[PDB]
Amino acid sequence: KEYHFKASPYPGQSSVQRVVIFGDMGKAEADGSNEYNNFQPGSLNTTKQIIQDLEDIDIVFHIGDLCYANGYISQWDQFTAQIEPIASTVPYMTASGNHERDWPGTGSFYGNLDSGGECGVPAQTMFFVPAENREKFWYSTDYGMFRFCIAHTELDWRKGTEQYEFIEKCLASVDRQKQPWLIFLAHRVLGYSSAGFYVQEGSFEEPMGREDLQHLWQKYKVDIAMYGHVHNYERTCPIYQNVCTNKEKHNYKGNLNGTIHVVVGGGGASLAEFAPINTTWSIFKDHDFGFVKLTAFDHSNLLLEYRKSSDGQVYDSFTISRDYRDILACSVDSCPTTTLAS
Amino acid sequence: DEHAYIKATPNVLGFEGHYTEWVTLQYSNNKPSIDDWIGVFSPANFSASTCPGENKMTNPPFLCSAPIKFQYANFSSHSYKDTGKGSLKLQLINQRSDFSFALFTGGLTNPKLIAVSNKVSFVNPNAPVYPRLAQGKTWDEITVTWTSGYDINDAEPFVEWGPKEGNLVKTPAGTLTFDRNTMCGAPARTVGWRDPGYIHTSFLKELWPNREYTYKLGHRLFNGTTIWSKEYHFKASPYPGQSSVQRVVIFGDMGKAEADGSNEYNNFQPGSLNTTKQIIQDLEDIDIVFHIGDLCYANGYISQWDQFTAQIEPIASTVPYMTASGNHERDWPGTGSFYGNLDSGGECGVPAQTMFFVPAENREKFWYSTDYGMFRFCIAHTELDWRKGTEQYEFIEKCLASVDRQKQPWLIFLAHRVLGYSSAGFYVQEGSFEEPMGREDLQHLWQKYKVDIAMYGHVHNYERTCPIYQNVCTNKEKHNYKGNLNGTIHVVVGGGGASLAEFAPINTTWSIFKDHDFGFVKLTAFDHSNLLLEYRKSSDGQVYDSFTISRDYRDILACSVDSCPTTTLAS
Amino acid sequence: SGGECGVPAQTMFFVPAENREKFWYSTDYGMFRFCIAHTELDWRKGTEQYEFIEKCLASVDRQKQPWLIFLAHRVLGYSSAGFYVQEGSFEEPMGREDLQHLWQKYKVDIAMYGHVHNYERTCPIYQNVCTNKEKHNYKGNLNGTIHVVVGGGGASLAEFAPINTTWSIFKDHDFGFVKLTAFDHSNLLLEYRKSSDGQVYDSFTISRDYRDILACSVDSCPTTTLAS
Amino acid sequence: VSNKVSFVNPNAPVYPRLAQGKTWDEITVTWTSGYDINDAEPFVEWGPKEGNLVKTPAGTLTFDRNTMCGAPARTVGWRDPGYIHTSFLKELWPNREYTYKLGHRLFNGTTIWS
Ligand SMILES: *[C@@H]1O[C@H](CO)[C@@H](O[C@@H]2O[C@H](CO)[C@@H](O)[C@H](O)[C@H]2NC(C)=O)[C@H](O[C@@H]2O[C@@H](C)[C@@H](O)[C@@H](O)[C@@H]2O)[C@H]1NC(C)=O
Ligand SMILES: *[C@@H]1O[C@H](CO)[C@@H](O[C@@H]2O[C@H](CO)[C@@H](O)[C@H](O)[C@H]2NC(C)=O)[C@H](O[C@@H]2O[C@@H](C)[C@@H](O)[C@@H](O)[C@@H]2O)[C@H]1NC(C)=O
Ligand SMILES: *[C@@H]1O[C@H](CO)[C@@H](O[C@@H]2O[C@H](CO)[C@@H](O)[C@H](O)[C@H]2NC(C)=O)[C@H](O)[C@H]1NC(C)=O
Ligand SMILES: *[C@@H]1O[C@H](CO)[C@@H](O[C@@H]2O[C@H](CO)[C@@H](O)[C@H](O)[C@H]2NC(C)=O)[C@H](O)[C@H]1NC(C)=O
Ligand SMILES: *[C@@H]1O[C@H](CO)[C@@H](O[C@@H]2O[C@H](CO)[C@@H](O)[C@H](O)[C@H]2NC(C)=O)[C@H](O)[C@H]1NC(C)=O
Ligand SMILES: *[C@@H]1O[C@H](CO)[C@@H](O[C@@H]2O[C@H](CO)[C@@H](O)[C@H](O)[C@H]2NC(C)=O)[C@H](O)[C@H]1NC(C)=O
Ligand SMILES: *[C@@H]1O[C@H](CO)[C@@H](O[C@@H]2O[C@H](CO)[C@@H](O)[C@H](O)[C@H]2NC(C)=O)[C@H](O)[C@H]1NC(C)=O
Ligand SMILES: *[C@@H]1O[C@H](CO)[C@@H](O)[C@H](O)[C@H]1NC(C)=O
Ligand SMILES: *[C@@H]1O[C@H](CO)[C@@H](O)[C@H](O)[C@H]1NC(C)=O
Ligand SMILES: *[C@@H]1O[C@H](CO)[C@@H](O)[C@H](O)[C@H]1NC(C)=O
Ligand SMILES: *[C@@H]1O[C@H](CO)[C@@H](O)[C@H](O)[C@H]1NC(C)=O
Ligand SMILES: [Fe+3]
Ligand SMILES: [Fe+3]
Ligand SMILES: [Mn+2]
Ligand SMILES: [Mn+2]
Ligand SMILES: [Mn+2]
């Protein structure tokens, strides 16, 4: 049958541009049947809310933990069918997570059994992303005023690695006058999360998540970094080195001096509990299913909305209102070299 | 008691698709003074409120709405001071919106508004205008960038193009713009602001080398009507490495000036029209132009960017017009520019990186490589750090390394500020014959990769060095260079138009020729073994300095000091 | 060297260099630390010598030894000597560009040169630009290194170029030498004396405390954490 | 010494050689002729086997005696190579069968074909 799409903007184009991001949606049988790995009770709701709002969604990023087939391969087809009403009309951009890739003794950085023996093969074949090497699954992509830099948290990301080199190149190549909104995406939490499972191992991130990469996020002024993996929603203050760099909760203005980190792993898979710690930097939490929409109105105004999958309504939000000169201004560990000469 | 008037004729300009028109103004003041003046305003609804200066780049007249241009009431009506009657003929370019004219008393420093004219406008203020060509990402792609008043919701922009008298096709354009709050400081963000319209770029791909093409700019309005420009034309560039006679013009610092003699902000480029004129006259024998920074000197009086695109249009609409970024494009304190000068007047690179296209990976960084047949050019951005360890230095090394010198023998390095050698008084007064740190890291690369000629703007004069490395001449010839020269020749060619710069009273060991005048360089590659440089004055287009290089591939491959690859002893 | 190739110099005299052929070394005198370079070997970033210089400048405890002095024969800093200016330079080619990173990062107070047979003193300076406008009585963080040509010890005098730069505070086309007097940890005096009479013809003082050495300057500002 | 002998057209396009191009769906055709760019415009006409054909341009390169670094190449062994042309056949369908011909459009208007 006939399908249709609207071509993306020219990079840097001034138009209203809408992006949906979440992780960990998975799948489920709309006929109520049971199936292997049937632990994504929010899956159909999230899919439903995106389809309902599709007229006002331009592109989707599903940031790892795609279908949770975990080796019951039949479910990849199931997932492509489930998302077809979305993915057949707007780009459906993927990242790789632990349930896509992890298997011990396969060169994955995490040795978990989480892929159920898939070792990335279905994910890197069923879906296309414009990675130089689809096995590595890191890539850059644009949507008008937005630049996205997608990491693969099941390969090493630390300084000295191939991946880190890629990330730095991606963050450095964007012209921020034309493309102000710089977004970093990854499956596992490389930034900040109050997930119970992290806190129990004495961390608010994957071990080694942020320490090397925050140099790049700060140097290149990443506006928002978003993660899946933790099955809930959490938003931080603009932050660097565990310290809030701006005290606003909603109306961000000018140079924020740090990146905002957002966990949006509530796409469908069984909810994850938060630790009983309310940190200095954790502005909002939601133990429920939901997703984020970013709306770039113009080159100076961005909106983030968190929407629940149960009703599609907005439960958290913020705006960034700032000009090119605020991106160019120095921040801590974000201040280019100078000459004294004239 | 002035009972003044001012009136403009005609009030509809640019019939038959014309985008320039002469207007006659006539005016009167019952109490005339020699310091009375007329301002041209676009939009026509201007504020004559005073907005006092706030930095050295906000200049008189201090009006909240900066005029487009201005002229004294007595300019051509020399009895004005006695009669209180005058007239002016002004040549207006179409740059969207409409125009008003205003008469003032009190001079540029203490103006008082005494009369405003009727409004005048082009028939189509939004018409597609001032295309400029630039080489694209590959040898067989050329880009067409133009300005209109049509946003993407008003009309779908495109270019219709193909081989001369052959089949034509439509190709899309990307549309970009910028707004007042994109400007980093005053005057650009304040008194100098003017809406730039919409800047469209089309990519004309799969070119046949050397083939003649035609193109037209179009906008398909959503009511179904298409608005078209006149036809333009160009000849596609050679295949890289092609043997044919290839001619390249290079200069910096040309700026802009008013052909009708009018004053305007930053009106300190008295050679500008002469350089533009000489290039236009010789255009049949010019294949590509490089304007290496200090483009129009708008410096935040934004209206002048359209002026500049119009000024160069007879050149840039037919040959690629490749730009580099200089201090007057980019410098602004606290903006990540390596130089913290106020020289951009708050633009912080935005107009330069939007009005013009270059095939840079990151248009904000403004460094890039491009080819023209036997030439390879590597263009640096001297308003960002260039030293070893920087992103820019890594780029430069990659550019110099990627060229196959058998096929493309002529390797040219271009930069705005002087990274090489200059005897400019201003450098020598700070104890230098370069920008501080200009050459020390980069000469490693120039020498290792045998850059033939390195050229700079920024200093408003011409100067040529011997082939040189580490401040020492490596070849003693003045004009007829043969074989392996063992060093790079450096040339200051910043005499394109901006007010001349004096030389220091030192004649160095390495300075072969100096000209304190306006002019430009033409490089002619006759074949793979023979290159000519000519320096021409802008006043007459004649040659006042020149040299030739005659050498073969084996000369490029031969070792020089700090340019000798590793070997094995094995066989 | 007339064929000596360093042999007499490196045998007739002892210095506490690890390798006497290389002739670069560090030495102390109370509140002073001296780092002595060898300008007849490469000094640029990446060289063995540059690595030594950085190690020397880094190892000094500036509370205890506030006065950090860099010494070299050829002019690696700034000189208005006619012979330099005729080759389009106010230094040896490549003299300062890599090393000023180190002078500035480690807050070298005074850098001194021979080779040019005259005396000349600059403002506190970095990247060809004066960082402090005082001519004699320096207080606090000067934000740059003071450079001094003191090659007027005896050899035939060298003429200055007919340029007076922005940074050249004092020049003497005559024979003479410098004496540095450290009175205490906060007060240093430089005197230029002519050899003909032993009298003082130029001088300055630096009065500053440890906290001034520790304060950030341009290209001299250590990393921080936001954490507490 | 004998009488002279010649091919009817010594300048004819000859000896094409294919090489993979810069992407998986590009192939290059390189050939030799005696027609410089001022003598004729070179091209390749190509398309799917028994399908529609299109013309694509060629870049033209050569070298001369003084390009050679030493003897015999620069001396007794030198022989003029004519002109070497390369076309880029893009947007290929994988596994599909194609045909091509080498062409030179003389500026008198006649085209010489392989
Ligand atoms: C951490 O964050 C929350 C701050 O709003 C606390 O949860 C909320 O606490 C309110 C007043 O204590 C209460 O009205 C809300 O219903 C409750 N839960 C929400 C918003 O989901 C949380 O407090 C703990 O969580 C529950 C069990 C509370 O009832 C308290 O007993 C707990 O202290 C804060 N946690 C800590 C450790 O401070
Ligand atoms: C589409 O919008 C155009 C812009 O308004 C129309 O052109 C305008 O037409 C007016 C007379 O109808 C004329 O006064 C305007 O100056 C002119 N503007 C320009 C830039 O051309 C256009 O109308 C068509 O073209 C005009 C000139 C006449 O020929 C009409 O008969 C045409 O309708 C609009 N086209 C349509 C189909 O409505
Ligand atoms: C999926 O979304 C549905 C529809 O909103 C949720 O169902 C509603 O949930 C609340 C609380 O249980 C009730 O007030 C409504 O009566 C429910 N059913 C309706 C309106 O049909 C449902 O809980 C969501 N599923 C998950 C797993 O979150
Ligand atoms: C025409 O107007 C100009 C500009 O106001 C007059 O030029 C000024 O002349 C006075 C007296 O000679 C000088 O003090 C000023 O410096 C000039 N100003 C400028 C900006 O040039 C000029 O005298 C007038 N000429 C006539 C015939 O009216
Ligand atoms: C622009 O070029 C014109 C034309 O050559 C220059 O005007 C001439 O200047 C020369 C001096 O070299 C005079 O001898 C002629 O009388 C002038 N005019 C003409 C029409 O020939 C003018 O000087 C140049 N402008 C600048 C600023 O250099
Ligand atoms: C070495 O110093 C002596 C002693 O000061 C210098 O001889 C004197 O020169 C001055 C000029 O400054 C004369 O006025 C005196 O008459 C000289 N002699 C004495 C004994 O006082 C001598 O010029 C210096 N040598 C050099 C090369 O500078
Ligand atoms: C264009 O030039 C070619 C080459 O000269 C012409 O073809 C030749 O025609 C002559 C007869 O006049 C034959 O003897 C040659 O053998 C032909 N050579 C080749 C290579 O085909 C051709 O006829 C000319 N075309 C026109 C329109 O004048
Ligand atoms: C530089 O050389 C030129 C040409 O010989 C001459 O006119 C000028 O006077 C010289 N300047 C000096 C300082 O020697
Ligand atoms: C240039 O350089 C080398 C030194 O490496 C020298 O021996 C050679 O003869 C020189 N050649 C020319 C043409 O000056
Ligand atoms: C340099 O300054 C000194 C002292 O003012 C003076 O005697 C000398 O003439 C100056 N030289 C020049 C070229 O100005
Ligand atoms: C020196 O340097 C800093 C710039 O880092 C400046 O802000 C400070 O006030 C200066 N201090 C002095 C004493 O000049
Ligand atoms: Fe998950
Ligand atoms: Fe200039
Ligand atoms: Mn996961
Ligand atoms: Mn300049
Ligand atoms: Mn010496």
Residue numbers in the entry:
A (entry chain C): 249 to 590
B (entry chain B): 20 to 590
C (entry chain B): 363 to 590
D (entry chain A): 135 to 248
Sentences from the study reporting this entry:
Diphosphonucleotide phosphatase/phosphodiesterase (PPD1), a glycoprotein plant purple acid phosphatase (PAP) from yellow lupin seeds, contains a bimetallic Fe–Mn catalytic site which is most active at acidic pH. Unlike other plant PAPs, PPD1 cleaves the pyrophosphate bond in diphosphonucleotides and the phosphodiester bond in various phosphodiesters. Purple acid phosphatases (PAPs; EC 3.1.3.2) catalyze the hydrolysis of inorganic phosphorus from a broad range of phosphate monoesters and anhydrides in the pH range 4–7. PAPs are acidic metallohydrolases with the metal centre comprising an iron(III) ion and a divalent metal, which is either a zinc(II), manganese(II) or iron(II) ion.
The homohexameric organization of PPD1, as revealed by a 1.65 Å resolution crystal structure and confirmed by solution X-ray scattering, is unique among plant PAPs, for which only homodimers have previously been reported. The overall structure of the PPD1 subunit is defined by two domains: a sweet potato-like PAP domain, containing the Fe–Mn active site, and a previously uncharacterized N-terminal domain with unknown function. The N-terminal domain (residues 1–150) of PPD1 consists primarily of two β-sheets making up a seven-stranded β-­barrel. A 26-residue loop (Phe59–Pro85) joining β-strands 3 and 4 extends about 20 Å from the barrel and into the active-site solvent channel of the PAP domain. This extension positions the Lys74 side chain on the loop 10 Å from the phosphate-binding site and 8 Å from the Ser589 residue of the neighbouring subunit. Five disulfide bridges are present within each subunit, three of which are involved in positioning the structural elements that form the trimer interfaces. The solvent-accessible C-terminal end of each subunit (residues 583–589) is oriented by the Cys577–Cys582 bridge so that it traverses the adjoining subunit, protruding into its Fe–Mn active site and placing the side chain of the terminal Ser589 within 8 Å of the two metal atoms. Analysis of the crystal structure of PPD1 using the PDBePISA server suggests that its most probable quartenary structure is a hexamer, with an estimated dissociation free energy of 42 kcal mol−1 compared with 24 kcal mol−1 for the trimer. Previously, we identified an Fe–Mn bimetallic centre in PPD1, examined its oxidation state and demonstrated that it requires iron and divalent metal for its enzymatic activity. The crystal structure shows the active site of PPD1 with a phosphate ion bound to both of the metal atoms, similar to that previously described to be unique for sweet potato PAP. The Mn atom is coordinated by His434, His476, Asn345 and the bridging Asp312.
